[PDB]
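[retry 2/3] Non-structural protein 3: previous attempt timed out, resubmitting with same input.
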Amino acid sequence: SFSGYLKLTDNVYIKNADIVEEAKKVKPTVVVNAANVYLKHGGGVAGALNKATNNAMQVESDDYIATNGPLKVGGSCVLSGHNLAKHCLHVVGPNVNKGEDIQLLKSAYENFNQHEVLLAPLLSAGIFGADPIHSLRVCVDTVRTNVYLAVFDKNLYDKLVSSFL
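[retry 2/3] Non-structural protein 3: success.
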């Protein structure tokens, strides 16, 4: 199972870890990808999860987009987890660097409630430009299912834990 996670609340846990390495080790039922609406997995968590699948996530995602069109900001889709997980829940948090509404971050986290347990990154954090402290607060106040947060950045992990109310 998951190991080395600090318990933040009844259902939210956090670890300073690369989500790709956590997924390879744990092979959870659901790994969350920090996706964009086009499922173009170029960088950050998406690029790293996709690279770990040898681009199979991108091929599957391109077929999904060709059939269904883009996701909404705040939306999600369930696709294969390939070699990393049973499923990948691709969730689109707002990208603040694109002027996307930060209120959609709560909508994005609501997608996690459809899954009993998830391995996930902090939505809209990192290259998406939102305040990770705010993202963790929205996570804890929105997600009711068991979420194991993998925070790649060590200094950010320390700051998130020490400032947690």
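[retry 2/3] Non-structural protein 3: The chain has one domain: 1-165.
[retry 2/3] clearing retry counter.
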